[PDB]
Design a protein around this ligand. Sequence first.
Ligand SMILES: CCCCCCCCCCCCCCCCCC(=O)OC[C@H](COP(=O)([O-])OCC(O)COP(=O)([O-])OC[C@@H](COC(=O)CCCCCCCCCCCCCCCCC)OC(=O)CCCCCCCCCCCCCCCCC)OC(=O)CCCCCCCCCCCCCCCCC
Ligand SMILES: CCCCCCCCCCCCCCCCCC(=O)OC[C@H](COP(=O)([O-])OCC(O)COP(=O)([O-])OC[C@@H](COC(=O)CCCCCCCCCCCCCCCCC)OC(=O)CCCCCCCCCCCCCCCCC)OC(=O)CCCCCCCCCCCCCCCCC
Ligand SMILES: CCCCCCCCCCCCCCCCCC(=O)OC[C@H](COP(=O)([O-])OCC(O)COP(=O)([O-])OC[C@@H](COC(=O)CCCCCCCCCCCCCCCCC)OC(=O)CCCCCCCCCCCCCCCCC)OC(=O)CCCCCCCCCCCCCCCCC
Ligand SMILES: CCCCCCCCCCCCCCCCCC(=O)OC[C@H](COP(=O)([O-])OCC(O)COP(=O)([O-])OC[C@@H](COC(=O)CCCCCCCCCCCCCCCCC)OC(=O)CCCCCCCCCCCCCCCCC)OC(=O)CCCCCCCCCCCCCCCCC
Ligand SMILES: CCCCCCCCCCCCCCCCCC(=O)OC[C@H](COP(=O)([O-])OCC(O)COP(=O)([O-])OC[C@@H](COC(=O)CCCCCCCCCCCCCCCCC)OC(=O)CCCCCCCCCCCCCCCCC)OC(=O)CCCCCCCCCCCCCCCCC
Ligand SMILES: CCCCCCCCCCCCCCCCCC(=O)OC[C@H](COP(=O)([O-])OCC[N+](C)(C)C)OC(=O)CCCCCCCCCCCCCCCCC
Lengths: 231, 168, 105, 35, 96, 78, 78, 78, 227, 85, 103, 52, 29
Amino acid sequence: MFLFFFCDLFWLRLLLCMYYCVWSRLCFIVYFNCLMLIFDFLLFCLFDLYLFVGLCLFLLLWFMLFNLYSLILYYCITYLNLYLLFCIVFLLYIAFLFLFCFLCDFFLFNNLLVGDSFMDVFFIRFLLCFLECFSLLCRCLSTFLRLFCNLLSSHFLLLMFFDFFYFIFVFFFYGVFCYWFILFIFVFCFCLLFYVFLYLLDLFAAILQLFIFCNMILQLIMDFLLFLLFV
Amino acid sequence: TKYELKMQYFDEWMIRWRKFQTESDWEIEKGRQWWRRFNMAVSGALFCGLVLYTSGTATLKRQYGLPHFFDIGVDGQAKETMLKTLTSRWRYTPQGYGRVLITGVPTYILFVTLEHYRERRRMQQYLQQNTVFGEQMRRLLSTGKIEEYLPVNIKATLPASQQAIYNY
Amino acid sequence: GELFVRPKLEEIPPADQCRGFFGPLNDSLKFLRLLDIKWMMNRAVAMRREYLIATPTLFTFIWMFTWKGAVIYFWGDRAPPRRMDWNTEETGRLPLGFKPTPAPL
Amino acid sequence: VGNGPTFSTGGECMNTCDIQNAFPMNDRGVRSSSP
Amino acid sequence: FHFHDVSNDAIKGMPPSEALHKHLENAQLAHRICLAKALKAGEPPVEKCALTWGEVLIRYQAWSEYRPPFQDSVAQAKYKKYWSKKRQEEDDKNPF
Amino acid sequence: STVAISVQGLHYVGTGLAAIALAGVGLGIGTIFGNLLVACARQPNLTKMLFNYAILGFALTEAIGLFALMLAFLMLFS
Amino acid sequence: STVAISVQGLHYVGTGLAAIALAGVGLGIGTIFGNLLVACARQPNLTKMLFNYAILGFALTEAIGLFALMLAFLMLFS
Amino acid sequence: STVAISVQGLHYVGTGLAAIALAGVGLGIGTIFGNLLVACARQPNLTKMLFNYAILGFALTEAIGLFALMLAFLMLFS
Amino acid sequence: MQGSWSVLKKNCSNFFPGLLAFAQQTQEAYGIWLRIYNRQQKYGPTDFVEQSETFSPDYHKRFHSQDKNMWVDKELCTEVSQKEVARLMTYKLDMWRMAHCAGALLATGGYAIPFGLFWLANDTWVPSSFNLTGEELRAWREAQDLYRYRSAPSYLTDTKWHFDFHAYPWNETQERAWDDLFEKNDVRRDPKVVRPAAEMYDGFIKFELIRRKSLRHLCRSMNIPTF
Amino acid sequence: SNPADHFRPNLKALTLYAERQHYVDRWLHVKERWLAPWYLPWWSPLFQLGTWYSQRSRNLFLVENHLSYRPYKFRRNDEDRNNPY
Amino acid sequence: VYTRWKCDRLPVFQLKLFTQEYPMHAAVGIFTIIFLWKHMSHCSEETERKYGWWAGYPYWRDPIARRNETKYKQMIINNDVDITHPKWTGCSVEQLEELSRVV
Amino acid sequence: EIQSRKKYFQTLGYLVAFIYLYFLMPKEKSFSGLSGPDGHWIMLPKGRPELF
Amino acid sequence: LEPMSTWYLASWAMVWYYAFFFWMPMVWT
Ligand SMILES: CCCCCCCCCCCCCCCCCC(=O)OC[C@H](COP(=O)([O-])OCC(O)COP(=O)([O-])OC[C@@H](COC(=O)CCCCCCCCCCCCCCCCC)OC(=O)CCCCCCCCCCCCCCCCC)OC(=O)CCCCCCCCCCCCCCCCC
Ligand SMILES: CCCCCCCCCCCCCCCCCC(=O)OC[C@H](COP(=O)([O-])OCC(O)COP(=O)([O-])OC[C@@H](COC(=O)CCCCCCCCCCCCCCCCC)OC(=O)CCCCCCCCCCCCCCCCC)OC(=O)CCCCCCCCCCCCCCCCC
Ligand SMILES: CCCCCCCCCCCCCCCCCC(=O)OC[C@H](COP(=O)([O-])OCC(O)COP(=O)([O-])OC[C@@H](COC(=O)CCCCCCCCCCCCCCCCC)OC(=O)CCCCCCCCCCCCCCCCC)OC(=O)CCCCCCCCCCCCCCCCC
Ligand SMILES: CCCCCCCCCCCCCCCCCC(=O)OC[C@H](COP(=O)([O-])OCC(O)COP(=O)([O-])OC[C@@H](COC(=O)CCCCCCCCCCCCCCCCC)OC(=O)CCCCCCCCCCCCCCCCC)OC(=O)CCCCCCCCCCCCCCCCC
Ligand SMILES: CCCCCCCCCCCCCCCCCC(=O)OC[C@H](COP(=O)([O-])OCC(O)COP(=O)([O-])OC[C@@H](COC(=O)CCCCCCCCCCCCCCCCC)OC(=O)CCCCCCCCCCCCCCCCC)OC(=O)CCCCCCCCCCCCCCCCC
Ligand SMILES: CCCCCCCCCCCCCCCCCC(=O)OC[C@H](COP(=O)([O-])OCC[N+](C)(C)C)OC(=O)CCCCCCCCCCCCCCCCC
């Protein structure tokens, strides 16, 4: 089976072509932490710690073109599938993990064995190492699951509320002319307030979820970085 | 001669018509698997030997010197013996692409040669078989094409409870 | 976190100081050090070779999370049924009177 | 005067940006939007 | 002619090979019935018997792929290891 | 014997149980805001960092609340 | 055999379970106002800002109550 | 005698119970951030280390909640 | 330099004479290298001969140490002359490029022929022995210089940017040395003023910690094949 | 249900089907055509890359002796749990 | 001065980007694509009927049946398949004629 | 200049594509069958009688 | 729910793979 379809960004691709044929400065970045990894001067890293900037920026742009514009009614999030997000997070996370593993430095994993020599090695430290190795994969899974479920739930809620608003607005507006107009006016104002609140909440939540999605990958990278001090 | 190009069609057909796989063919495939594992083992041993031979003197001293993890006494004796054996004579210890080539090319050549000749051996074995698979192999080598549904054409043997289809 | 420096040869405690599951495997019990996993773990921790404990674990997880997971899921053998359909070893053989084609020559 | 654009600013206030020193300051105390 | 019973209830207590063979025989019977009807009507067989032929083809594909396992040392060892007396008793006790 | 049943109304029960998860979500939000007021009382100048972090936590909890709401709708509309 | 049972009274249970979600909302609001009173005494000069923040938190909790209440009425009628 | 009954709707009720585990997750997250604001109010300069540890705690808590979601979806589709 | 039909014809015409000259140079360079290697193994320091291991402090990855894994044979003039050393270096470059090409040929069988056509159309990666006249040698040198111009600025910018964004000089003299090290070739740099930068960078990054991307840029600038 | 139906791609244009046997056979023919010529020796890395892994996978499939039944990959109906056929 | 992004054409820059900037990511992406097309590229007829149609499967015209019919007719006509062969029918041609005369 | 020309052509192409997609292209697998294709099989064998 | 479906997962993921391998270089340059 081979299905031929198209993403829902064609108009946005046209706009990007129209507006970015000429250069322009970028100063606001959703995830700015990918550009400043070191805060204490004289610390430098021999590992390619800035390799994630390009992928981070492209992912932010793509996910913003999809999610933020999905608030507009009937707009489609073409990539919204659990296993597709699993594929994306697998690509990124496992790529960085295999970059660290291909380094062939086993000492890099010394920190996996949690605790000190005082703790029993077999009955405490080994169990902690097992749990942390499990927690890495769980972090990957959690990133992808959170990204999927936030969008799915928010859009379900928006659709349900819009259906209720349409129903009451269409089939109960005549009450404006009746003696119970005050009840309808109260309900209508309540609905407008909830509409605005839902839109604001979704707007903020999409950006925040993208921030956290990039933050998880940067955290994975940071968990294996070692900084040397200039002398 | 390139036996893999001929054998890929036969293997795919056998997978599609695996029901008619006699125990002899199954044994042939198990032997092929065992020989693949043996080839892998010998290639790995050769690669390890080449790596050890070309290792630097300081590297060998660090690897086969103190401390001893177990300190049983046999471990130290063996490590000292190996270190002395390696460091006694002069050894060509290249680095970079040279070591890569020296360590890999022999291993790759050995593995590929062994696997190719084992593939030829398996082709001969299937040729010598007196089962439907052997007939299919002979027909493939003769006409150059795989004849699907051959077992039902020549009426290959079936279980006593499944011979009704042949009843014509 | 911080940089790791391998211990010097003089900073490594002696093997006899290591403890096993029950007690130290000193003289008359050295050959049991090979079989005692906890003794080996303690020795590795003492010698600062902790990676020997961590590297096999993490890698294993990866090997499961990447390649063997799907292999088991898609091609693994489930539990056998109660009534088993064994092979009668009757299928495959050529029928009587069949003239097989000659082998290459 | 024409209606053409100028050196882009990205919507950043040069009096508080992290590279403010690279923008010259005029008599009024307002840093320039361009070099 | 008589079609075999390949319903879920009947299939439940049947070996895979027997079920596959029964499905193949049913497909062949349906195809031959359709061909006989076409011949009686005199119309071409290809224009009427395509779907039945395809069903026979797919049943053949499913039937020829399965090879019942050979009963040997390792297979018997696995079967005995999984099916212990305790497990057999538990299965007998279970109503499902 | 071999028996099989399907109850239509059970999907309502599962929906209500999922909604209970919001009890630990709404309370969690109050805890964040409860701490926020105390923090703002003893560090008025640093209201910016505290208010932003309070929003951050609220959205994080709201994610969990949205997790449960999705299951509730799935068990309510299907 | 196969049975298709439709119970007409199970939506009451689901509605009640959804209504339980308000226990968290009420407690969350109580926590917000409890901290507000403590904070006001600590730094009374910032009463208005703390009052506004408490209202913000209350609104967010009330919305969660509406989501929980949304699942209640739907089940109750549907 | 022994009667095997295969009820279908019981896979919904179990799902709703699993979601209740989220109640202890959302509250736990709120506790972390509630303490974060106070900690920032007490040692505001140390905001970064507190923020990172809060994220670490939030991550670990979220992992537990997902395990509940894993069970919830497994039962919902079973 | 971009490929051209004239260069393709030039290299095709001189292909077999070039191979023969390369073989003769291979024999001569093998003799020279045998002499040099014997001298190094006999009179070299213990660390240099035993290939002492130097590991980075962060990921413990081995790399050549300038102090230990490099040795200057002060008494090499007795056995090997300067011209022989220059010949050996030139043959090393040519042999590296020829080895890469031969490896590609062996790997891809007969499917490398069109890529061989692309190769002979450019003088960037052809051996110096393929030039049988002064003009051809001049064009080949021009191609090499073009490759060096293409690659060097990236390496210089990488080094300067990484250091300047992750560290600063300690004293004024080091500041001047660093600033004057990366001046354009139009101006003349005083080696005495610039030398302290060597110690400063030794403080920052030695040759044993050089990163793989910077190594790729350096190899590009040195006309060493990288793929 | 109806709300769930809103999360589908909205620009589906065409669907093409192909049996695994057919396109696998076509790919094998292409590979044989490209790996046949004499100027590509069997010991070259490219030829081995092309052939060895496929041979190993097919051999692993052939040696397989599973006590359980694996339903046909391309059945007409695979949505029924109580009917592997 | 020379820069990959500014001087190279798009295909060359793409190859450079995914070979000397993000090679591991490209390798993992190809691995995942191969897995997806090896294990998630099939759909049975029942699955298509249940979920494969926007508004539902139109049983009143059964498009799947017509699609399969066209497929099988094309295969038979092009490959010159004798669908009356005993293997397809399970009986001899004479038996088929007898059955046709009977029914 | 190069980017301006390229983006001009790309904008025209994307405008054509957008118009076709959102105003002309029919959705596949329609219930009534009045618009869009129902799909078909490809790569079928041809001229291979031995295959069957 | 299609978001939970896998009957056409490969064709669905082709969109992301095209975006990553073919559109990222264009957005990059
Ligand atoms: C049998 C029926 C026919 C179908 C046959 C199919 C055969 C299939 C074989 C088997 C394949 C199996 C695997 C399939 C997997 C599919 C997966 C999938 O789809 O995932 C979704 C996923 C969706 O991606 P997306 O996010 O939508 O972005 C991709 C877009 O292309 C947009 O992304 P982008 O913008 O980033 O792309 C770059 C874009 C950059 O932007 C542009 O260049 C702008 C233009 C964009 C064009 C592409 C968008 C298409 C929009 C819809 C169609 C437009 C109208 C067509 C009108 C048709 C009318 C009938 O540049 C281009 O696209 C370059 C092409 C430009 C062409 C310009 C031509 C100008 C001609 C001028 C002629 C003038 C003549 C004058 C004469 C005068 C005489 C006097 O698809 C893909 O990733 C691509 C899948 C492709 C797989 C390969 C298929 C094989 C090739 C088939 C070619 C058929 C040609 C013959 C057709 C004839 C008409 C019927
Ligand atoms: C450097 C990288 C760092 C970054 C890593 C980044 C990634 C994360 C890491 C984790 C991996 C992530 C996963 C990513 C996907 C990668 C692909 C993948 O997973 O595919 C697996 C995939 C799994 O197979 P499958 O497709 O699922 O099919 C299953 C079938 O079994 C397939 O059937 P088959 O026909 O292919 O056969 C396969 C065969 C493979 O094995 C063989 O063919 C035979 C053995 C080969 C040996 C190779 C050479 C080893 C060294 C030789 C000796 C050297 C020293 C010589 C000098 C000695 C002086 C005394 O295995 C078996 O069937 C098992 C046979 C076991 C027999 C055991 C008999 C009992 C006695 C021996 C054991 C017990 C001893 C007790 C002693 C007690 C003493 C007190 O492929 C394979 O594993 C098999 C093919 C590849 C074989 C490669 C063999 C070499 C492996 C490397 C060895 C050296 C490095 C390790 C040590 C390093 C130390 C510093
Ligand atoms: C179409 C062809 C297809 C080919 C496929 C095969 C793979 C690709 C072939 C090669 C491709 C070309 C490029 C390769 C990488 C080059 C790396 C490089 O630049 O190295 C420079 C380096 C030269 O630099 P150097 O300064 O002279 O020395 C390096 C320094 O020591 C460096 O100093 P350092 O400070 O960095 O020291 C650390 C260094 C120390 O290491 C070294 O440098 C020493 C050399 C390596 C030693 C490796 C052996 C270690 C001991 C193994 C013991 C095994 C016992 C098992 C017993 C089992 C009993 C049952 O590295 C390590 O510590 C790494 C140790 C290895 C860990 C392996 C972990 C594997 C995890 C497996 C996970 C699970 C897998 C799946 C499941 C399997 C089981 C079911 O090269 C070498 O030293 C050796 C290079 C060897 C290249 C590979 C040769 C390939 C031969 C292939 C033959 C078979 C062909 C099959 C064809 C099939 C049909 C198509
Ligand atoms: C037929 C089977 C084929 C198998 C498949 C092969 C597939 C292709 C892979 C590449 C194979 C090699 C290609 C030819 C290279 C030319 C010979 C050579 O090594 O030149 C020296 C040169 C050494 O480089 P280096 O960086 O200077 O070495 C540092 C050492 O410290 C240097 O040490 P040093 O500083 O002390 O100085 C020593 C120097 C001093 O000498 C000199 O200065 C005098 C000049 C000597 C070298 C002359 C080279 C001339 C090259 C051009 C030849 C003519 C081409 C004509 C083309 C047109 C024809 C019409 O002499 C050397 O260079 C000696 C190096 C050590 C020997 C290496 C050869 C080992 C393999 C051969 C034996 C095989 C035995 C098999 C047994 C089987 C048992 C079962 O070679 C290179 O440039 C390296 C190769 C570059 C391409 C690498 C591509 C990736 C390779 C990955 C292989 C992984 C394992 C295999 C599996 C692959 C699976 C994917
Ligand atoms: C007889 C001779 C003597 C004997 C033989 C001797 C040995 C010879 C061999 C060795 C030679 C070595 C030296 C070679 C140097 C030249 C290299 C080169 O190519 O330079 C660029 C070369 C031009 O060089 P240049 O002008 O001198 O500039 C050099 C500068 O220095 C610029 O330099 P640069 O540094 O900027 O350029 C570098 C650039 C080089 O690249 C390029 O420049 C790209 C070239 C292609 C561009 C194509 C653009 C046009 C596309 C058209 C598309 C179709 C249009 C429509 C057609 C319609 C037809 C009807 O980038 C790269 O190097 C990237 C490397 C990427 C490596 C990829 C590795 C993948 C590994 C996979 C992962 C594995 C992981 C491990 C997995 C392990 C699992 C176990 O490019 C071309 O000439 C382009 C040719 C385009 C041909 C037409 C389009 C393709 C036609 C395909 C036909 C297919 C027919 C069959 C179809 C069948 C269908 C079923
Ligand atoms: C309604 C049901 C819903 C179920 C949902 C279930 C979850 C589905 C999630 C899908 C989306 C997420 C996918 C993430 C990625 C998963 C990856 C995965 O597990 O794939 C494994 C699979 C396993 O492959 P396989 O299935 O072909 O395994 C063959 C094993 N035998 C032969 C025994 C059957 O990998 C692939 O699909 C890619 C294989 C080709 C690429 C790798 C080749 C090199 C292999 C090296 C080792 C062996 C050779 C020797 C060394 C090299 C010599 C040259």
